[PDB]
Amino acid sequence: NELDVPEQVDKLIQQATSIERLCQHYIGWCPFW
Numbered sequence: 001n002e003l004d005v006p007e008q009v010d011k012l013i014q015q016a017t018s019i020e021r022l023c024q025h026y027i028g029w030c031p032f033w
Contacts, residue, residue, distance in 0.1 A: 004010060012019075016033065023030035 020030050020033065
């Protein structure tokens, strides 16, 4: 089934294009991906 039930997650993920740019740029720690 669509194991992708997490919603605020998918949005966050879809919006993680930033949080990723943050760590990778400022810090560099984004393993939750």
